[PDB]
């Protein structure tokens, strides 16, 4: 199959405005949310129907308890960072963990933290060490690296358990995750040529312009891949017309193993 990934995010906020949760945790398979938990509901809940339909209530009950523990841990950790930074006011703490199963069968695994939305600590599961961005992170690095067994545990989770979870969820959601919806592609004149694609799944797509059979990366404007709201995506790319000389322009789209060319006459 194509490349797929599993990742879990956590967000803690130290002094949230009224109503807004102190803690949020959301899981994703590829671009799809699968799970959610926050400090207001204090419940882990499905975010995709093929998760709800395949995981029994004991799963949600058990991880609800773990998440209540992780929420308290996240608050303690953020309190410690903000004390060490000598920071007043509201600050954020984030974690991301997960893995990728690549098309060729290889795997990757990652775990990192951020403070105020910037890299703070990054785990290297091959050297079994934490990269620190500053001296507050460095203090935390020292304490985490003194617990060699927890490092080994995280390497095992990233390399073995995460990949097993991903394969299990990929099969649960195979009707959604493993389908293909090819793009509808057109060109219009707006002077610039706009190559537009819509209606496609998965969101990964490569669109570019060629000028007489040569790519022009520096002159091409690349639009974002955007959710259309119905489970499919849209995207575009534009290139500016030289009004002083004609050229053979052509838009090239690659999606899910199929290449297409729209040669503009």
């Amino acid at each position, epitope marked *: 199959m194509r490349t797929h990934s599993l990742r879990y995010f956590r967000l803690g906020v130290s002094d949230p405005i009224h109503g807004v949760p102190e803690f949020i945790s959301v899981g994703y398979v590829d671009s799809h949310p699968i799970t959610t938990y926050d400090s207001v509901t*204090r419940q882990k809940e499905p975010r995709a129907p093929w998760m709800a339909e395949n995981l029994a209530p004991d*799963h949600w*009950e*058990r*991880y609800t*308890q*773990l998440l*209540r*523990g*992780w*929420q*308290q*841990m996240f608050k303690v950790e953020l309190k410690r960072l903000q004390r060490h930074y000598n920071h007043s006011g509201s600050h954020t703490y984030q974690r991301m963990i997960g893995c990728e199963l690549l098309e060729d069968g290889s795997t990757t695994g990652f775990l990192q933290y951020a403070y105020d939305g910037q890299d703070f600590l990054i785990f290297n599961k091959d050297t079994l060490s934490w990269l620190a961005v500053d001296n507050v992170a460095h203090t935390i690095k020292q304490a985490w690296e003194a*617990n060699q*067994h*927890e490092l*080994l*545990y*995280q*390497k*095992n*989770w990233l390399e*073995e*358990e995460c990949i*097993a*979870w991903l394969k299990r969820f990929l099969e649960y959601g195979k009707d959604t995750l493993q389908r293909t919806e090819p793009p509808l592609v057109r060109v219009n004149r707006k002077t610039a040529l706009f190559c537009k694609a819509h209606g496609f799944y998965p969101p990964e797509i490569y669109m570019t312009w060629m000028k007489n059979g040569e790519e022009i990366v520096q002159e091409i404007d690349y639009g974002d891949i955007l959710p259309s709201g119905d489970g499919t995506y849209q995207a575009w790319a534009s290139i500016e017309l030289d009004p002083q000389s004609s050229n053979l322009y052509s838009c090239h789209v690659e999606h899910s193993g199929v290449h297409m060319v729209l040669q503009v006459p």
Partner: antibody, heavy 109, light 116 residues
Framework: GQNIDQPTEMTATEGAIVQINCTYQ??????LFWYQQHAGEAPTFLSY??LDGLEEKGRFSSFLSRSKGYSYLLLKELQMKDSASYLC??????????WGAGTKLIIKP | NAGVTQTPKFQVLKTGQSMTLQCAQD?????MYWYRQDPGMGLRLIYY???????DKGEVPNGYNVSRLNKREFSLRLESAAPSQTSVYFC??????????????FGEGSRLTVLE
């Protein structure tokens, strides 16, 4: 279901070596623990393994093979005070601890 | 520096009698557990508390209830004792839970015998 197996009882001679085996079949694996429990007392933590290989800690070493689903606790230069039960335990995919029934180690002076 | 302190060490009960076992830990741990140990089988979790302010059932919750009173204390209640609850009960705690490598610290054990 998930199962963990270890022999009920083992007997060895003072000064010798003993290997206590633990085999597990679990849904996911987040590490294997060994505990010592003297008769009438609380279990206390001996070792943790989660990657493959041998780890040493005094006269005790603990080995793990994830692919075989196997660990042993190796006790060298046995002494009478090693007479105790030895409990194996495995954390499954959901961090639930699955406990073996324990191996009673008897040491002949 | 006492670790995990549970009481009582021994107790005899008549079928139908109520009993509370106390457990406290002074290690600033977040997770607490109540286990029973019976001949011929591995420890079985009765109830646990992953953090202050939450509790949930273990493998053998029926006939028991728990109260995580504060960060330090986790009491186990037998409302109507049954002969099958004759056992050795162990309270335990750990720094956090889900931390894969974190080990358990056990109390000294409470031996209950329930008689008709």
């Amino acid at each position: 279901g998930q199962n963990i197996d270890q022999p009920t009882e083992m007997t060895a001679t003072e000064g010798a070596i003993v290997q206590i085996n633990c085999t597990y079949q679990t849904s996911g694996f987040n590490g294997l623990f060994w505990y010592q429990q003297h008769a009438g007392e609380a279990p206390t933590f001996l070792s943790y393994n989660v990657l493959d290989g041998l780890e040493e800690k005094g006269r005790f070493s603990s080995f793990l093979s994830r692919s075989k689903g196997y660990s042993y606790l190796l006790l060298k230069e046995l002494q009478m005070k090693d007479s105790a039960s030895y409990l194996c335990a495995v954390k499954d995919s959901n961090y639930q601890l699955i406990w073996g029934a324990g191996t009673k180690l008897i040491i002949k002076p | 520096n006492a670790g995990v302190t549970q009481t009582p060490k021994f107790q005899v009960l008549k079928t139908g009698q109520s009993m509370t076992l106390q457990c406290a830990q002074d290690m600033n741990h977040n997770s607490m557990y109540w286990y029973r140990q019976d001949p011929g089988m591995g420890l079985r979790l009765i109830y646990y508390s992953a953090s202050e302010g939450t509790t949930d059932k273990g493998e053998v919750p029926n006939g028991y209830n728990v109260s995580r009173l504060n960060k330090r204390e986790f009491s186990l209640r037998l409302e109507s004792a049954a002969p099958s609850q004759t056992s050795v009960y162990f309270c335990a705690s750990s720094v956090w839970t889900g931390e894969g490598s974190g080990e358990l610290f056990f109390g000294e054990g409470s031996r209950l015998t329930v008689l008709e």
